[PDB]
Amino acid sequence: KTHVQLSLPVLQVRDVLVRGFGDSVEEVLSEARQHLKDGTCGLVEVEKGVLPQLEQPYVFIKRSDAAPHGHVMVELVAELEGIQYGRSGETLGVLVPHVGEIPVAYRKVLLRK
């Protein structure tokens, strides 16, 4: 399928134990996609002071369209030293590995895979 319905655990930035996916734009997009498939991916909602507490390169989920079955359609965009790789809509948050942190909420998305 080109799209997959996922429910992403929303984590508080100060709870996150693994604060990014790796060391290059290509690796973080790769790793993010693998963790999304494996159900081991969390979402941090971006506000003032969140991104400097996480590791670059960043992987964002961004709204790709204006929401089947409650699931917002999203795609992945990476960012490193102020340059983004991908072009998409509004940020829903920054993806991180999930290693058992307790979420505050779930975000239903339809991921372009």
Swiss-Prot record:
Region (Disordered): 1-113
Source taxon at top rank: Viruses
Subcellular location as annotated: Host cytoplasm
Stretches assigned to the CoV Nsp1 globular domain: 2-113
Protein purpose: Inhibits host translation by associating with the open head conformation of the 40S subunit. The C-terminus binds to and obstructs ribosomal mRNA entry tunnel. Thereby inhibits antiviral response triggered by innate immunity or interferons. The nsp1-40S ribosome complex further induces an endonucleolytic cleavage near the 5'UTR of host mRNAs, targeting them for degradation. This inhibits the integrated stress response (ISR) in the infected cell by preventing EIF2S1/eIF2-alpha phosphorylation upstream of stress granule formation and depletes host G3BP1.
Protein name as catalogued: Host translation inhibitor nsp1
Primary gene name: rep
